[PDB]
Amino acid sequence: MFMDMAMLVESQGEMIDRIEYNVEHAVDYVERAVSDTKKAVKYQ
Amino acid sequence: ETRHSEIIKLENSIRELHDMFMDMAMLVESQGEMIDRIEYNVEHAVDYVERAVSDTKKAVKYQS
Amino acid sequence: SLESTRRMLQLVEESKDAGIRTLVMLDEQGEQLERIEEGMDQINKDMKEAEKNLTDLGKFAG
Amino acid sequence: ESTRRMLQLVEESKDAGIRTLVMLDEQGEQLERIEEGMDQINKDMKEAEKNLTDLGK
Amino acid sequence: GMDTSGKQAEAMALLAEAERKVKNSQSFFSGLFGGSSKIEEACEIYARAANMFKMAKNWSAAGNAFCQAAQLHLQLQSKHDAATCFVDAGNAFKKADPQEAINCLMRAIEIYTDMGRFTIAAKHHISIAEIYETELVDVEKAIAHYEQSADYYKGEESNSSANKCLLKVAGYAAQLEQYQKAIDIYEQVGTSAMDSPLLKYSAKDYFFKAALCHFCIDMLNAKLAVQKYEELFPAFSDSRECKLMKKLLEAHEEQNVDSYTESVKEYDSISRLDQWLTTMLLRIKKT
Amino acid sequence: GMDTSGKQAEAMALLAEAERKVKNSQSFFSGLFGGSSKIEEACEIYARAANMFKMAKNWSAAGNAFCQAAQLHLQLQSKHDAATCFVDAGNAFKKADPQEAINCLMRAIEIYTDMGRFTIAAKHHISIAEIYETELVDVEKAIAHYEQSADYYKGEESNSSANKCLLKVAGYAAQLEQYQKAIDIYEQVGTSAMDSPLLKYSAKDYFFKAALCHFCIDMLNAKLAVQKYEELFPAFSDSRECKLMKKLLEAHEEQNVDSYTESVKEYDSISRLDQWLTTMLLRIKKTIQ
Amino acid sequence: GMDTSGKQAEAMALLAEAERKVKNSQSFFSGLFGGSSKIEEACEIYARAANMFKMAKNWSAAGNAFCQAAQLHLQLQSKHDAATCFVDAGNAFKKADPQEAINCLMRAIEIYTDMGRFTIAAKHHISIAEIYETELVDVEKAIAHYEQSADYYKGEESNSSANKCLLKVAGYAAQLEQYQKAIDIYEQVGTSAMDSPLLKYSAKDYFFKAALCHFCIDMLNAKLAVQKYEELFPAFSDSRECKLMKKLLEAHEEQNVDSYTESVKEYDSISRLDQWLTTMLLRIKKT
Amino acid sequence: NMAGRSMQAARCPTDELSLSNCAVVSEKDYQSGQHVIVRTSPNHKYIFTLRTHPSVVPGSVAFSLPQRKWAGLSIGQEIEVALYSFDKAKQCIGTMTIEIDFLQK
């Protein structure tokens, strides 16, 4: 059971790292998007 | 008498393992508790973003 | 002897119960993490496409 | 010979528990950061879209 | 202390400003036809006022404000934000007076199932069932809610989630002098986890419970059930559950009450039992 | 190295650029009225300079720039980004100046809660208490902050975090503060764990701590409390700690300091101390007269 | 495989029409000066063709397409997209030819650091260090990257990642016979782990390693160091590490190889020894 | 030299010198027959006699294994060595009692 734990939690760790990368990517992208959209609205 | 020494060692190690799992339980429970809240937040975020973007794009595209 | 038997049996039984409980518990966290992964992918794709289309429309207007 | 097996496997299980503990602590450390990032993005998108909709009127 | 008093005072002021806002906004809509931005402003003010009410440690009024905002917003042709407001009102009403909390959570469930999401609906169902169990004595509504949540979880291919609800339903059914549903759930869950490397360790325990709940009827049926389970789970005899069941059977066959009680006491000594098992064994010992 | 010197030089250059840019932005708004693009651009330049400066291994001016940018952004009716920048500046000043970091963190706490979020505010309270206690010699402020965090968590029915905060507060109180609050909190947490899924065998330690705390008051209260625990929790009856308590009480009853010393020594040999029971035992033994 | 290779040839044609878009930028964009979205969709089709190459297992071609798309997209705008394209190119280059992957990852490091996101910067630093170790033989660059990543992680109070990175750095330095840094890092990590209740079990091992390193430099000072560790941690003598170290040092007082050989064989008799410990013992006990 | 200069511990270059119980130093530093005080701490001061050997690097005082064991010195460490003068009318050695035993078992 300890070994099964170890392996399962290792998989969980890998995929949590992946999702964290993705969420930070999305955060930065949306921040830049809102900045650009507000600038464009100001241009009008 | 050597059996007494080895069983004392067994007692120490077994108590250590018991306390270790005792610790583990609360940590994993807190992890799950945080997981549920992040799930709620992400579902609310996606739902609101989807509906708002759809509605506003439809409103701004069909006014012309 | 008897005391060793008793202590070892009780502690082993407690450890077994705790271990089986945590083994059962891990699955809910795994499934929740998978679901949030799917939701994050949906959010990222939808927002990216929406922003790109909106920028294209803004360029068309201008 | 049974006693030696008990000793060896007990120490192996102890080491496995310690390393699992370290890894779990790492995951717990990461969880709060991802949660804060989610909250920040949520607030940013909400305020941005609300302001844009208000300006649209 | 001082913080709560100040928040409450400014929240009363904000409520006065909000009633003024709604009245003057409807008047201005009638007399000028300004649009609908003022209604959105009123909704935002109401949401902020409800949050401030929650700050002041006044959950009832905070929930009232949340529900008012939810109804106004759904009147503004938008449900999901009203759904969030309803859920927040239910959370606020969890303490103090939860009677309206149940109804508001039911409304949230209704709107969500109208939208389609299953998992949030199941979560609300289980939350309502837990509220009923902890705060009310009527277990029929809790059983219905748990059964519905288990069905929804099973439909969504979430076997692990449905298992917990099914186990709770089986336990409460066994509590209320009902064994057929409990027996069926116990045997089904025991069979389900047969091939899993992880859950196989648990496979034995549930079976034992089933056997114990199959002895509440008679003796011969209990023997048939235990031998059938052993045939299906040859390793089951390895554990002490089978030995204890056989000891109980032989002791009750010869009306050996004292040996049965002594064996139960020694089993408790080696490993303590819970209220469910203790009361079940006491009921069994009644005859 | 070239990297640090160049980073600091360009940080000074861009700080001068941002200062002249804000002055020229005032001049523009008074002369051309171009809107708010100027101020937002100045804030973005300030944020870029602050982040690169905090890369540059110098923290004080980076946090100062973060705070200034947050203030200028809040000047434009924006709070979320201002609050996040306040949090970042407090994090930066954590290793530079505790007082300014604490001011920024409390400002972030109040603005975030005013927005309507409590759990984040609870985490901020916990961090503030931790930074107080780790480097500054103070407890009362930490106790109050932990109590507020527990209250916020319980308001959001976060049982685990609230219970952890309450247990930490009770331990700190028992260390210095009186026993009544510690007694009540320990008894509550012990009685609220009789049917925990994974912690069915955990409340015994909390009941042991409560019994020891009771023993610090008087002998009669000690024996009455242990009897009440015995009656309330049958499992505690078969606990090694219960036998230890009975042995210690009997040894102290006859004023046999040797019996108490040998009992505690045997307990230590069987089980290693925890650094918290030893001080209580020493205090009790000091009043053996 | 082959039909997908035909569509990969079609993706080469897509790159050819992307070159036609570059020709548009060169000549026809004078009348299409507003066609910035044309350049954006040119980058999009570049990325799609690169993905098609990725499916075709043309790692070099996919990496070249990624690098070209990154270079074209970094028109002083959308910096994060350019950094993502660069890291994608590096991942494509992870296999086959990773040398240019190092430069692309360094550029991505610079860009992400310019944003100020230290987590991803340290992650990529660890990535380049590990690919260096598993592909190239140079260790000084790897150790420098490890140091930089550990400093970045420690800046944001991330103690665990920095501690593990520093443990690896100390091990590598010990391999490169720089023992002062190794002992310093091992002592720091041990004292940090002991402080928290959750990390008190591991401490023993760390101490052992540190002691060994110290015993490599000064034999006489080894006794003082082990005594200091013993008094610092009263529960250090009980564990087998302290007993074995005491046996080894008390046997080394006299020139008796049999004693240490038997001791090491007996200690190995309970558990296998790793390459690091075996090599360290073989080198140190030679004289 | 008279006041005291920093020096580095070194191993005795030759076994023959290891039999002389002399703190071997380079020719460029001191002269044979001089007596110096080795300082490692405010309380731990000892005195050695200097003998010149070609292999000694300047600025390092070589100590045989017995000297290192007696003074607790570590090769490569820093010490302060100053010139020590013996009062021939007071510090001259009249009678010694010494303990002698087999070096190797």
Side-chain angles (χ1 to χ4, degrees):
Chain A
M1 301 145 58
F2 274 32
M3 182 58 107
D4 273 9
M5 271 315 168
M7 44 98 80
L8 285 159
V9 195
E10 159 51 18
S11 308
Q12 307 330 317
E14 184 277 337
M15 70 171 209
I16 180 184
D17 194 320
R18 192 80 66 165
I19 59 177
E20 292 206 334
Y21 182 16
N22 291 118
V23 76
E24 196 164 356
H25 200 183
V27 177
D28 186 7
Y29 185 89
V30 66
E31 198 280 336
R32 210 203 72 110
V34 55
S35 182
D36 187 1
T37 55
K38 267 298 193 201
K39 180 52 167 202
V41 167
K42 220 169 279 169
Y43 143 82
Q44 188 271 348
Chain B
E1 300 78 325
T2 64
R3 306 287 171 97
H4 258 316
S5 48
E6 72 80 21
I7 185 168
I8 294 153
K9 149 67 167 64
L10 291 186
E11 148 184 338
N12 314 127
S13 56
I14 292 160
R15 289 257 312 293
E16 215 75 353
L17 273 311
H18 185 188
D19 311 359
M20 163 30 47
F21 194 115
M22 274 284 297
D23 316 333
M24 261 295 168
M26 291 155 268
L27 287 83
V28 198
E29 175 55 278
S30 302
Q31 306 266 108
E33 194 59 21
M34 179 314 304
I35 288 286
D36 63 48
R37 174 172 294 93
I38 174 171
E39 216 69 13
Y40 311 153
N41 269 336
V42 64
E43 296 324 314
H44 148 269
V46 63
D47 202 348
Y48 187 86
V49 158
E50 187 276 344
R51 188 160 97 169
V53 70
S54 58
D55 186 4
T56 199
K57 298 341 168 183
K58 296 288 156 55
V60 302
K61 196 262 172 184
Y62 304 147
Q63 97 302 18
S64 304
Chain C
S1 189
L2 57 104
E3 74 296 346
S4 168
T5 325
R6 175 69 180 121
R7 178 266 307 180
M8 193 189 193
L9 258 287
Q10 60 184 86
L11 204 149
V12 168
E13 158 54 8
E14 301 145 39
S15 82
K16 291 222 77 169
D17 294 2
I20 183 166
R21 173 65 206 99
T22 176
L23 273 169
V24 179
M25 191 265 268
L26 179 153
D27 311 334
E28 300 87 61
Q29 271 190 151
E31 293 177 352
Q32 271 182 318
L33 299 153
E34 274 152 8
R35 274 316 315 160
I36 181 169
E37 194 280 343
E38 301 283 8
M40 101 192 173
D41 263 321
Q42 190 269 13
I43 298 154
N44 185 22
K45 184 66 168 302
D46 270 327
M47 80 186 208
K48 298 259 197 172
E49 190 152 325
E51 202 229 337
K52 184 35 60 200
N53 281 316
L54 267 280
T55 47
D56 302 325
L57 192 137
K59 172 64 222 79
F60 167 82
Chain D
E1 52 83 17
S2 66
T3 308
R4 304 152 210 168
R5 289 143 66 155
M6 286 195 275
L7 307 206
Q8 293 185 0
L9 279 309
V10 165
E11 53 81 11
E12 168 268 352
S13 84
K14 176 193 292 292
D15 308 320
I18 301 316
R19 53 217 203 200
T20 308
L21 160 55
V22 153
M23 99 188 265
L24 167 139
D25 301 354
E26 208 187 346
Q27 331 312 350
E29 278 192 351
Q30 289 297 272
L31 288 171
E32 198 284 338
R33 277 310 325 156
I34 174 161
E35 171 176 354
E36 202 286 332
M38 150 263 295
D39 274 318
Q40 177 269 7
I41 179 169
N42 165 38
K43 179 57 174 72
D44 300 355
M45 81 205 198
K46 293 329 198 75
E47 55 88 9
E49 71 88 33
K50 188 48 55 186
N51 271 341
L52 263 296
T53 52
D54 181 12
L55 193 144
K57 300 287 286 186
Chain E
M2 163 265 278
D3 302 333
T4 294
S5 65
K7 297 314 302 183
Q8 197 160 18
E10 58 214 47
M12 291 315 89
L14 183 58
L15 259 285
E17 294 167 352
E19 52 82 11
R20 160 199 144 196
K21 262 286 182 177
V22 62
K23 172 58 181 64
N24 290 339
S25 51
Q26 62 167 335
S27 296
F28 281 126
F29 183 80
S30 60
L32 186 70
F33 203 97
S36 301
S37 305
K38 56 190 79 65
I39 296 100
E40 307 171 34
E41 188 277 346
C43 167
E44 278 108 41
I45 290 293
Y46 261 15
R48 204 180 52 181
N51 299 18
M52 220 76 97
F53 274 42
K54 191 188 296 185
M55 301 215 188
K57 312 293 169 287
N58 199 342
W59 289 262
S60 177
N64 309 149
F66 281 128
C67 187
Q68 293 157 0
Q71 61 176 3
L72 265 294
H73 198 89
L74 70 87
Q75 188 275 346
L76 199 62
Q77 297 90 37
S78 173
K79 293 74 162 178
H80 276 230
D81 291 336
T84 76
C85 291
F86 281 126
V87 174
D88 203 325
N91 161 284
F93 288 134
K94 166 58 180 305
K95 60 203 77 64
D97 182 9
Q99 197 280 333
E100 65 279 0
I102 303 301
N103 169 270
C104 80
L105 282 167
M106 276 157 83
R107 180 185 294 92
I109 283 158
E110 184 67 16
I111 180 54
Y112 282 155
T113 187
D114 293 326
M115 181 48 228
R117 289 283 201 200
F118 276 75
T119 315
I120 64 185
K123 205 71 179 180
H124 286 339
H125 305 145
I126 183 167
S127 181
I128 291 170
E130 168 49 28
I131 290 166
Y132 275 179
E133 191 280 341
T134 189
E135 201 268 324
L136 294 183
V137 55
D138 172 47
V139 296
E140 282 64 6
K141 289 176 184 177
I143 288 163
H145 277 286
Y146 270 111
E147 196 271 349
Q148 192 66 39
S149 58
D151 173 22
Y152 276 141
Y153 264 137
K154 184 154 56 176
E156 201 61 20
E157 298 296 343
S158 55
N159 81 337
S160 306
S161 304
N163 234 1
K164 177 188 59 40
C165 300
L166 285 173
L167 259 66
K168 294 282 282 297
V169 168
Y172 268 21
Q175 178 53 90
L176 270 67
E177 289 201 342
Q178 271 107 33
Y179 314 145
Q180 294 302 333
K181 278 188 69 172
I183 285 160
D184 299 329
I185 296 301
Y186 270 117
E187 65 85 13
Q188 191 279 340
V189 66
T191 307
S192 176
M194 270 306 319
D195 60 359
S196 179
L198 311 178
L199 308 184
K200 56 191 290 299
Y201 312 121
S202 68
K204 52 177 300 317
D205 182 7
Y206 304 155
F207 268 101
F208 171 72
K209 274 190 173 180
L212 192 58
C213 80
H214 215 171
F215 185 54
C216 296
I217 306 307
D218 285 317
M219 260 192 299
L220 76 168
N221 51 15
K223 187 198 165 57
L224 290 160
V226 65
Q227 59 85 12
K228 190 195 308 312
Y229 292 155
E230 191 64 51
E231 169 270 2
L232 184 54
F233 205 92
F236 188 30
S237 181
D238 208 353
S239 63
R240 77 186 96 169
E241 274 65 0
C242 302
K243 303 280 281 194
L244 203 149
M245 181 97 177
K246 296 164 187 303
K247 286 180 182 63
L248 168 149
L249 285 166
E250 59 157 2
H252 186 217
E253 168 55 31
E254 205 72 357
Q255 281 79 3
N256 193 2
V257 302
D258 196 62
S259 188
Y260 166 37
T261 63
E262 180 63 7
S263 300
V264 168
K265 167 263 174 199
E266 201 171 332
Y267 181 56
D268 172 15
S269 177
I270 178 53
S271 183
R272 185 178 82 158
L273 292 69
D274 70 345
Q275 288 291 298
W276 194 86
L277 290 172
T278 53
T279 206
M280 191 145 188
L281 267 300
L282 193 144
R283 154 169 50 156
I284 291 290
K285 194 224 292 181
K286 173 59 193 173
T287 299
Chain F
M2 71 75 88
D3 51 355
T4 63
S5 57
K7 289 281 159 296
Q8 277 127 35
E10 69 180 16
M12 195 72 106
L14 268 168
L15 259 295
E17 196 279 343
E19 291 156 299
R20 67 176 62 268
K21 178 69 208 66
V22 58
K23 182 66 76 69
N24 297 134
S25 79
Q26 300 290 339
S27 77
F28 297 152
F29 199 88
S30 68
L32 190 71
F33 179 30
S36 303
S37 62
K38 53 199 85 69
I39 298 110
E40 279 297 347
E41 178 275 346
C43 177
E44 292 304 335
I45 294 300
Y46 273 118
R48 189 70 55 202
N51 71 33
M52 84 204 180
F53 200 83
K54 70 169 175 55
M55 325 174 36
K57 173 56 194 314
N58 184 338
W59 285 98
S60 304
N64 174 27
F66 278 121
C67 291
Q68 288 177 352
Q71 173 181 350
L72 265 294
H73 197 64
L74 189 66
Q75 197 273 344
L76 297 175
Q77 305 289 350
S78 184
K79 56 189 83 68
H80 45 284
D81 186 13
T84 57
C85 192
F86 262 55
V87 166
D88 176 81
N91 162 247
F93 277 174
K94 183 182 289 188
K95 310 212 308 310
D97 47 348
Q99 195 58 226
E100 285 69 355
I102 286 295
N103 295 121
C104 305
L105 215 46
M106 62 173 81
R107 264 272 299 105
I109 280 157
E110 56 182 345
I111 188 62
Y112 252 68
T113 187
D114 177 70
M115 271 175 28
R117 298 128 178 87
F118 307 89
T119 50
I120 293 167
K123 180 65 64 166
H124 301 339
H125 310 140
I126 287 172
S127 300
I128 280 180
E130 181 272 346
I131 187 170
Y132 286 151
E133 65 89 3
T134 42
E135 50 178 18
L136 328 179
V137 47
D138 192 318
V139 295
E140 277 76 46
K141 313 311 191 64
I143 307 325
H145 281 292
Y146 280 117
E147 187 271 344
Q148 263 294 0
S149 320
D151 188 325
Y152 280 112
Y153 282 142
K154 183 134 63 172
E156 300 293 352
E157 50 272 17
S158 188
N159 82 318
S160 295
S161 58
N163 289 5
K164 277 176 293 219
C165 289
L166 279 173
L167 195 145
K168 187 162 283 186
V169 164
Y172 266 63
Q175 184 169 11
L176 308 176
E177 193 168 49
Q178 282 61 239
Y179 314 84
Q180 169 52 27
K181 294 168 53 168
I183 284 162
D184 202 329
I185 297 296
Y186 271 101
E187 196 180 10
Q188 161 165 325
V189 69
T191 319
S192 187
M194 302 300 201
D195 198 0
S196 285
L198 286 150
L199 305 85
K200 257 206 172 280
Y201 48 101
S202 80
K204 55 186 277 285
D205 303 359
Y206 315 145
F207 275 91
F208 162 87
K209 278 191 173 67
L212 270 183
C213 289
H214 265 299
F215 185 34
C216 199
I217 296 161
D218 195 73
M219 313 300 299
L220 185 77
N221 299 118
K223 56 192 70 166
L224 270 277
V226 65
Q227 298 267 30
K228 259 78 170 181
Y229 295 143
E230 186 84 349
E231 201 270 359
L232 200 144
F233 201 41
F236 166 63
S237 316
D238 302 1
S239 70
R240 314 180 310 288
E241 279 68 353
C242 181
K243 267 75 78 173
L244 182 69
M245 263 91 72
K246 286 294 189 64
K247 192 195 194 193
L248 262 67
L249 210 170
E250 195 61 20
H252 207 133
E253 174 64 303
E254 59 248 11
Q255 203 264 319
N256 200 274
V257 69
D258 270 319
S259 173
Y260 189 8
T261 47
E262 65 192 6
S263 307
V264 62
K265 199 187 291 181
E266 175 265 14
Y267 182 41
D268 181 12
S269 183
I270 279 173
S271 177
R272 203 76 209 166
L273 57 95
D274 209 343
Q275 194 259 337
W276 204 292
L277 317 181
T278 291
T279 178
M280 160 84 188
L281 293 159
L282 197 144
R283 293 145 66 198
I284 281 297
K285 167 164 162 289
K286 180 175 68 56
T287 175
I288 190 62
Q289 72 259 18
Chain G
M2 197 58 38
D3 189 27
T4 65
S5 273
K7 157 170 62 173
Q8 159 270 335
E10 153 174 333
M12 171 62 148
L14 289 176
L15 293 166
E17 55 81 13
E19 180 275 343
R20 269 285 298 98
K21 298 301 188 304
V22 186
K23 192 195 292 188
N24 303 349
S25 293
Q26 160 264 346
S27 266
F28 314 140
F29 252 70
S30 304
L32 196 71
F33 172 78
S36 301
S37 186
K38 216 72 180 62
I39 306 302
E40 300 178 4
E41 59 81 20
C43 295
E44 292 291 340
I45 184 61
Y46 261 124
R48 300 284 157 208
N51 171 46
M52 301 265 178
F53 285 2
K54 187 170 181 181
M55 261 310 337
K57 297 164 286 306
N58 305 9
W59 309 127
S60 301
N64 311 337
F66 289 142
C67 85
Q68 189 67 255
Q71 172 47 38
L72 265 291
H73 212 172
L74 49 89
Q75 197 78 15
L76 203 60
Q77 303 183 8
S78 195
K79 300 174 298 317
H80 211 79
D81 288 2
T84 50
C85 201
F86 276 114
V87 68
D88 178 10
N91 280 282
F93 292 135
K94 172 57 183 306
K95 58 202 77 61
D97 181 7
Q99 203 279 331
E100 68 281 8
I102 301 298
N103 174 273
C104 87
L105 281 165
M106 192 61 236
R107 295 271 56 89
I109 280 292
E110 180 272 334
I111 287 283
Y112 280 171
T113 38
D114 189 3
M115 269 148 277
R117 60 202 70 234
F118 292 4
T119 64
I120 310 97
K123 178 64 169 299
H124 282 160
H125 280 110
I126 294 162
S127 174
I128 58 174
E130 64 175 329
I131 190 179
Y132 266 4
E133 198 273 324
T134 192
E135 306 304 337
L136 269 56
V137 183
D138 296 298
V139 85
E140 76 294 349
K141 304 200 69 45
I143 213 76
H145 302 325
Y146 269 109
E147 286 286 340
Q148 192 272 359
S149 71
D151 303 326
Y152 265 31
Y153 258 88
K154 183 156 70 186
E156 273 58 19
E157 300 86 39
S158 187
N159 60 14
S160 300
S161 292
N163 230 336
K164 57 179 287 187
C165 294
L166 290 168
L167 270 167
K168 194 183 283 182
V169 163
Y172 271 84
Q175 179 154 300
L176 198 70
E177 60 270 5
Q178 277 92 22
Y179 300 84
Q180 56 275 303
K181 180 183 292 190
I183 61 178
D184 287 2
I185 290 172
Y186 289 132
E187 275 165 345
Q188 177 175 131
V189 61
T191 56
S192 175
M194 290 175 74
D195 200 7
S196 291
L198 275 286
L199 314 171
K200 306 213 179 213
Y201 317 102
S202 34
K204 60 201 199 315
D205 190 330
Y206 301 157
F207 279 133
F208 175 107
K209 279 198 272 277
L212 264 66
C213 279
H214 212 195
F215 184 73
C216 209
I217 298 301
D218 222 348
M219 319 64 67
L220 312 180
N221 217 4
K223 293 176 176 53
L224 170 55
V226 64
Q227 261 62 242
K228 186 188 294 186
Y229 290 124
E230 216 172 20
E231 59 82 17
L232 173 54
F233 191 42
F236 180 69
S237 183
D238 54 10
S239 301
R240 305 181 300 164
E241 294 88 348
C242 197
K243 294 178 68 172
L244 265 292
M245 271 175 298
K246 289 171 70 59
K247 164 53 149 176
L248 263 72
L249 56 93
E250 70 198 40
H252 213 87
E253 298 295 341
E254 44 268 20
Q255 291 74 10
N256 289 118
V257 300
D258 66 336
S259 60
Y260 91 83
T261 54
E262 186 160 18
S263 306
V264 298
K265 294 301 107 170
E266 289 172 9
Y267 194 68
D268 193 3
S269 192
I270 302 171
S271 300
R272 292 296 307 268
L273 274 59
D274 83 322
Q275 177 275 126
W276 190 97
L277 286 167
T278 36
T279 49
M280 168 48 171
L281 267 293
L282 190 147
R283 288 192 303 172
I284 190 172
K285 306 309 299 304
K286 178 52 56 53
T287 40
Chain H
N1 276 9
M2 321 295 128
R5 44 188 288 197
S6 295
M7 321 195 68
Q8 321 314 135
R11 174 171 297 179
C12 187
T14 70
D15 315 327
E16 179 180 58
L17 279 166
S18 185
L19 302 170
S20 68
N21 191 41
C22 261
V24 195
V25 293
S26 171
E27 294 77 17
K28 302 166 39 170
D29 289 323
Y30 309 97
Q31 305 155 60
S32 293
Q34 289 188 313
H35 321 292
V36 299
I37 184 152
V38 168
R39 159 181 189 281
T40 51
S41 70
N43 173 266
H44 299 135
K45 316 282 212 317
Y46 282 152
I47 298 159
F48 291 100
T49 303
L50 303 187
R51 176 59 186 269
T52 55
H53 191 258
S55 75
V56 179
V57 310
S60 80
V61 191
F63 323 120
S64 62
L65 285 96
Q67 299 181 337
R68 299 212 305 276
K69 295 178 290 206
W70 160 56
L73 297 166
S74 299
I75 300 160
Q77 97 178 69
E78 78 202 27
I79 59 175
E80 275 199 59
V81 180
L83 266 288
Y84 186 87
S85 292
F86 282 97
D87 314 313
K88 304 283 169 293
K90 291 181 70 175
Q91 281 202 283
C92 261
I93 292 169
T95 306
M96 297 219 166
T97 314
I98 298 168
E99 178 177 333
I100 172 164
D101 201 355
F102 293 116
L103 183 63
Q104 264 197 349
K105 293 171 183 179

